[PDB]
Design a protein around this ligand. Structure first.
Ligand SMILES: CCCCCCCCCCCCCCCCCCCC(=O)O[C@H](COC(=O)CCCCCCCCCCCCCC)COP(=O)(O)OCCN
Length: 309
């Protein structure tokens, strides 16, 4: 076929939220057809699939005019910023890129690790080890945004097809755990511009990619800092963010299989080599040959240090 979308499910579970592929109303089906017809008339050719277009439509409550405007601006940004070649450009410089990513990994753990009960990629970030002075020595704010965009492209390219083949339904979103244990509120206020730039790119160019977003171990007074963040967040974004209390492990176990959840977050999941570190790891359906398709296997984001079991 040479059409990757033909090799994994393009309809979501019937238990998914409204407006999702396979779960549309008659009016929403007609909106999708009218939306695609407009983009085709404007000579767009790429990213016109049901999943992509319904993400944009859900983000705009199926307002077709607003959705076209959003899609048109996204395509412009992708071209101007280089999102369309980010993976290729990465691979053509993989050595240096890998080296820098490794430097940040212990300080700012970012790792996918199996899936939630619906098959979404299970994603973790730990923020309490960040030292700003040291971080500003290894990276720039624009570089971190580039890394975020690159991961958005890797998510769609490798993680969605593999997770969807395993779930037997289309997977569009992440189950994300943000661990704030040990952060300084001072640091948190100093990085407000980065958080809002992240929300900007997320909301404007990768609509409807959030699924579950849990914040755990937030310190006393964190509610005050979050009030600085909310004006950067759209209503739907805020709706997917769940700030967990001291019973966070039980909330996590409502959504995540115990065997997929790390021991320190309330499950039984361990690495195959107990000395390996989660911040060098990338474990999930996209590492299983059963579930990798014609897209190929994902590149190793930590080079030789990448831990895949
Ligand atoms: C040169 C270096 C200088 C750079 C300055 C910053 C350096 C340190 C970077 C750490 C500070 C920010 C950390 C949080 C960043 C925002 C969210 C990160 C996770 C993320 O990608 O979430 C997406 C963004 O959505 C959202 O917008 C979700 C909003 C939730 C954010 C809550 C705010 C956290 C406050 C704690 C900060 C602690 C600071 C300690 C220094 C949606 O989620 P998904 O499920 O689609 O993502 C998983 C698939 N990619």
């Amino acid at each position: 076929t040479t059409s990757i979308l033909d090799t994994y499910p393009q309809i979501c579970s019937p238990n998914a939220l409204p407006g999702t592929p396979g779960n549309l109303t008659k009016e929403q089906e007609e909106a999708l057809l009218q939306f695609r017809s407009i983009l085709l008339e404007k000579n767009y050719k790429e990213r016109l699939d049901d999943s992509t277009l319904l993400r944009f439509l859900r983000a705009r409550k199926f307002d077709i005019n607003a959705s076209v405007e959003m899609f048109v601006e996204t395509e412009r940004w992708r071209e101007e910023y280089g999102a369309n070649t980010i993976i290729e450009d990465y691979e053509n410089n993989k050595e240096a890129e890998d080296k820098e990513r490794i430097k940040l990994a212990k300080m700012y753990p970012q790792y996918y690790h199996h899936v939630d009960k619906d098959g979404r990629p299970l994603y973790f970030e730990e923020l309490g080890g960040i030292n700003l002075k040291k971080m500003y020595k290894i990276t720039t704010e624009k570089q971190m945004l580039r890394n975020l965009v690159k991961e958005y492209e890797l998510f769609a390219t490798y993680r969605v097809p593999a997770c969807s083949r395993r779930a037997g339904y289309l997977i569009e979103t992440s189950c994300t755990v943000l661990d704030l244990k040990g952060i300084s509120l001072s640091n948190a206020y100093h990085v407000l511009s980065y958080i809002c730039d992240v929300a900007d790119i997320s909301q404007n160019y990768y609509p409807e990619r959030m699924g579950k977003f849990y914040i755990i171990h937030s310190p006393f007074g964190w509610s005050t800092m979050f009030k600085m963040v909310k004006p950067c967040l759209d209503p739907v974004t805020v709706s997917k963010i769940f700030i967990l209390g001291s019973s966070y492990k039980k909330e996590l176990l409502k959504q995540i299989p115990i065997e997929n959840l790390p021991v320190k977050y309330g499950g039984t999941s361990v690495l195959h080599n107990p000395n390996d570190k989660f911040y060098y790891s990338d474990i999930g359906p996209w590492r299983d040959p059963r579930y990798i398709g014609p897209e190929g296997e994902i590149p190793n984001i930590f080079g030789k240090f990448t831990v895949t079991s």
